[PDB]
Amino acid sequence: MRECISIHVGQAGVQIGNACWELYCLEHGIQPDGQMPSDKTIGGGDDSFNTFFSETGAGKHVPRAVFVDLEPTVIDEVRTGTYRQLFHPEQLITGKEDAANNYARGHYTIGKEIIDLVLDRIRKLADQCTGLQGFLVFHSFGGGTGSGFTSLLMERLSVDYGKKSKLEFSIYPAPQVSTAVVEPYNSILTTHTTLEHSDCAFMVDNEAIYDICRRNLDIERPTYTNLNRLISQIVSSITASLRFDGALNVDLTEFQTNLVPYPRIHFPLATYAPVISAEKAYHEQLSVAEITNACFEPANQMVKCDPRHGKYMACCLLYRGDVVPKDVNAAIATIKTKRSIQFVDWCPTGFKVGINYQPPTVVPGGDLAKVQRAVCMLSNTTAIAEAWARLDHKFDLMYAKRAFVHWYVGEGMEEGEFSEAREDMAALEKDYEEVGVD
Amino acid sequence: MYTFVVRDENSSVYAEVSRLLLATGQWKRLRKDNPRFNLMLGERNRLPFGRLGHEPGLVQLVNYYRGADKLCRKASLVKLIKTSPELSESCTWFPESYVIYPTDEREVFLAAYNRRREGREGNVWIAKSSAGAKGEGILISSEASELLDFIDEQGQVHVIQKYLEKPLLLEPGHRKFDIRSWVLVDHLYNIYLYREGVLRTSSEPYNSANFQDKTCHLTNHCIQKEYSKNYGRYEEGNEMFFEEFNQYLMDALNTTLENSILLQIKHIIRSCLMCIEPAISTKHLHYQSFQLFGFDFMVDEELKVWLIEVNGAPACAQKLYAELCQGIVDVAISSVFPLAPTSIFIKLH
Amino acid sequence: MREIVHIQAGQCGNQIGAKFWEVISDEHGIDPTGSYHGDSDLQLERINVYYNEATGNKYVPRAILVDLEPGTMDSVRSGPFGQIFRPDNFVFGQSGAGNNWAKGHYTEGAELVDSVLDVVRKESESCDCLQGFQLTHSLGGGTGSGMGTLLISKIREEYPDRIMNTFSVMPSPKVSDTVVEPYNATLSVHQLVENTDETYCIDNEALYDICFRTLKLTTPTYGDLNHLVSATMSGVTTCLRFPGQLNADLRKLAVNMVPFPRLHFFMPGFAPLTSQYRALTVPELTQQMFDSKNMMAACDPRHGRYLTVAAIFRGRMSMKEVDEQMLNVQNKNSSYFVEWIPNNVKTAVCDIPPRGLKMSATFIGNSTAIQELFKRISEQFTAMFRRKAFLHWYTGEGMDEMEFTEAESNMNDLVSEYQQYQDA
Amino acid sequence: MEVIELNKCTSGQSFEVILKPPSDPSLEEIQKKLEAAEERRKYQEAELLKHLAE
Ligand SMILES: Nc1nc2c(ncn2[C@@H]2O[C@H](COP(=O)(O)OP(=O)(O)OP(=O)(O)O)[C@@H](O)[C@H]2O)c(=O)[nH]1
Ligand SMILES: Nc1ncnc2c1ncn2[C@@H]1O[C@H](COP(=O)(O)OP(=O)(O)CP(=O)(O)O)[C@@H](O)[C@H]1O
Ligand SMILES: Nc1nc2c(ncn2[C@@H]2O[C@H](COP(=O)(O)OP(=O)(O)O)[C@@H](O)[C@H]2O)c(=O)[nH]1
Ligand SMILES: [Ca+2]
Ligand SMILES: [Ca+2]
Ligand SMILES: [Mg+2]
Ligand SMILES: [Mg+2]
Ligand SMILES: [Mg+2]
């Protein structure tokens, strides 16, 4: 049994983390106080769920996680919330003043003062692992901490744990719920310095989550709590293979091996179905073919883009609920005949499928109805580079006038790092075009 | 009040559409690089589709279908017809064609040429390329050696195709011609065929014994208005419209335009556009598309219609600019942005 | 980033400063004796930004009162909320400044500034995490203008890494006290260009026109003008005082609003202004807050373009309707927003409306049309300066003619810099 | 349409379906750049303090 350590950075990373561990406890039958009646090996054991929870002699199951924010407001809610009993003080780290949506502030000015404390608190969880396999890092692109401090943490993790895998869950910026005009700068600065340190990263566009919540859940003006509950279900579908008995994606190395043939192109696209409103008293239950066909609708993707005008390098299907293999293969055969699904010539045209018989768990009194079966699809398609093109264009408009650049130089950053980072995104856009276009 | 931007200053069609929109008092034109637009009249090449449909609160519409070039490039059109089971590679309305690089189909092209060689059949083939604009880039020959050698001298991909040796000839004049139909596909993928077509005719008599004088063999307006010493001799601008052509068919052939030619044209349009519908429809996309197409047809002496090529950025005939441009505003623009009579289009289901 | 330190200087600065504290004290449920008598937890959640807590659950404004003569500060201490201020935090002299920038900055003010800095230092040291400072003052007189800008220069030297923010009242010959106001304003703008992060430009010409034309007041007084300034200041600090996501502190605000260090002079606006019980729809709020007649700087926004905009909506209303209405304003007037700053309009909503209204809206704009204000001042200045009129009042205090020449150059540069980005 | 590597257990199963075959900087360096930015930050502040002292 190999352990995994989760790391949550900035407001977005912390709040999504809170949503995820709530869902985990429900899925594994762990009460908010930490006790677990089903666990019969008291104070120990190396079950599948022990990759995310360690055990105390009193039977408490403690998440292998760390929370980091340069301001204390968001982590204090965790310290006093429903699951306050789950974590202990050493796992929650908070500064005094934040990065002010300024990457340079989170990376150079403030990051330099906290990086050793964070690394040392992480070293404590590592020392308690018999076989650590890597890290899962949650953060936003647009905030000064999520972008600036994360990139510094990734550099150091590569130095101190050189042989370990590192996975990202990243929130891509959307104006409909965004708090800063410079979010494009921060996004590109952090993608530049983080690229070579991340083995696999899942981008979630808030625009896409926002629209799914208005369309399928009938929420007039979605909130972060709405967004995070939906994001947590998707994150759970992706991590479920590490927490439950199974044979597909059982360690972090398998994500790279299965979804990332080229290191730089390590951003898989995620699609989820079905999303059903819970106030919808009477709703028909969708079949395996219906929820599998919905994995090819842009309206259900975590990043709006048209995969019909790209190419696939890999594709995994992860089902939870009443699903047997023959219904899946019957659905895939039908979809192949009606959809534009082009793989690159040097890759097999196939699908890796995992089925977990336990159907999705939903927070009681939440927005999502309980369904008999659901599926999350992970596909590495060049069409995701549409999101890089949007971002880079906004960056180009502002940088041509040097708008806001003085805020970064003021923190110690040189103007050269800007074009250095923008030249790297330009190369990345060229790598996607070489791979996917004729 | 709706807003739009212009990114193709050289479009005759949408310069007029842009004009009408303003004369309504309800459309405001924006600087070409302003993103808060309802309607984009986009550029021909490298249109940034990836940046459409991400402006909160704006319904966004563009005058091009992403992926429609598969139909509007001679090279890829051949591939689309050969490899699409919906078109079967055996469809009876597209001439035998092969793609030839200077992958490649050189070996299969020569195979059909020998079969016709020994068979004694008409073995005149025409080679053409995409960059072939304004009468230059074509070669009509009955010897394959001259064809391939003409291609190896050009760095661009080319297409070899059966030259239709038995065309339908207008009288008097014994002259070739071709039919241009304008087709509009709206955001819902309704297919609207403009009721008015046009024939682009050769003012010189067709001479099947000399494929070197590419005058009576090419119906292009540019070539007839320069090389042909009989320009405008029969019809004004070597353009004959459907009323006259129909009356002629009734007088000469005892038939009508609808029965002998239009049924086939309507069939061909539907087949092509339904084939690619799943690849380019914007029915559930975050932005919407419409596009005006120019289909070019040949007619042989058995009143059989042949598809020659599909143009994605076509122009109009002089006297037809008004009526058709208003129809774009009505069917494709005001249908999505309503403003505050028999149709000029035929709907194909 | 929690504590803000407030400073008010001179007659105008202290008369507006006092009204500001009456208005927001009311919103947070604090009574004139520093006791809290509210009914909503939202009132106390961020009360520490502007108030200190004393024994017995008392709240004390973190405010410092400065003047070179005692007159206006005796009135404050006798005013409605006069007893709520910390007595030690009154700092004043006797000579006054005779509406003379040089007396405030170089002679009279120099003698008093160290005492102010002692009180500033005392408030800053007890702060858990000092955000920065906000100053209220006018630019047309001597103390607020001359000593105010000296204070800012010395706070910066001692706290270079804190945000500096001002509410600055601009003179107008239509509401004029003396003919030398253009001299004083021009000397002050030079200081503010160098030493503040954000400056809300409040033009006494606009306040007068709004009282006369819109509110239907035949003969406005300063009290009438200050009622408008109170409402605006309460509006633009709503995001600092109540829980919320956007522009929640001074530095995040300055990052969102200031794309170039020198162009940090803001145009504020407020809606509604009515001469009372009818409900204002969200569409109505949005059209009035963007109308020039609701602007406080006497600049036609249609004469320039918006670099950035911050809007705040207060009350219980449709957040869906608010988003739709704001998107409609930008979409239907995209000519007036620069295109090289994407999504430069941000919007916030707070559930607690101001006193007396069911809903309201406040507007903060960084527009290149603010150059019209500096052009006004520059013309009035030059008209006198070309004949060296009234200069003896300043050379008698040790100033040289060259200093005036430089101040004028700097402001004409500032106008050129705005015109640069209006054509970009 | 070949199914391969079917693994079954009590809580689920996994398999693969194939439709068609084919056709770091040192810690010292990090400390350098971080201390380089801190130095530029100190120079800019020394210039302000010098300017204010004039
Ligand atoms: N989906 C989602 N997005 C969030 C959440 N919180 C913040 N964001 C997004 O993250 C971006 C802002 O970054 P933050 O995480 O809030 O900033 P930060 O990491 O705390 O860094 P600072 O600048 O120091 O505050 C914006 O695009 C927000 O829309 C959240 O809970 N859920
Ligand atoms: N296979 C064929 N058989 C007989 N005639 C043909 C032919 N292909 C083309 N032609 C004739 O030669 C001309 C070749 O033009 P081509 O097909 O290159 O169009 P083009 O791209 O040069 C101008 P457009 O964009 O209006 O079609 C046609 O107009 C037609 O008259
Ligand atoms: N809006 C407003 N303006 C004022 C008030 N008092 C003075 N002014 C203006 O302030 C400017 C300078 O005068 P003042 O502040 O009184 O001088 P100081 O005491 O030396 O700072 C002049 O332009 C006056 O028009 C006031 O109460 N409200
Ligand atoms: Ca156990
Ligand atoms: Ca004295
Ligand atoms: Mg934060
Ligand atoms: Mg052509
Ligand atoms: Mg006075």
Residue numbers in the entry:
A (entry chain A): 1 to 438
B (entry chain F): 1 to 102, 125 to 362, 371 to 379
C (entry chain B): 1 to 42, 45 to 277, 282 to 360, 369 to 438
D (entry chain E): 6 to 28, 44 to 74
Task: Tell me, in the authors' exact words, what the paper reports.
It is a unique site on β-tubulin that is located at the longitudinal tubulin–tubulin interface in microtubules, which readily explains the microtubule-destabilizing effects of maytansine-site ligands. The maytansine site of β-tubulin is exposed at the plus-end of microtubules.
To test whether the two compounds indeed bind to the maytansine site of tubulin, we used our T2R–TTL crystal system and solved the tubulin–spongistatin-1 and tubulin–disorazole Z complex structures to 2.4 and 2.1 Å resolution, respectively. Spongistatin-1 binds to the maytansine site by establishing a hydrophobic network between its cyclic core and the side chains of βAla397, βMet398, βAla403, βPhe404, βVal181 and βTrp407. The tubulin–spongistatin complex is further stabilized by polar contacts formed between the main chain carbonyl group of βAsp179 and the hydroxyl group of the F ring and between the main chain NH group of βVal181 and the hydroxyl group of the B ring of spongistatin. Furthermore, a weak C-H hydrogen bond exists between C28H of the molecule and the main chain carbonyl group of βAla397. Interestingly, spongistatin-1 establishes two distinct interactions close to point II via a hydrophobic contact (denoted point IIC; mediated by βMet398) and a weak hydrogen bond (point IID; mediated by βAla397), thereby defining an additional binding mode that is not observed for any of the other four maytansine-site ligands.
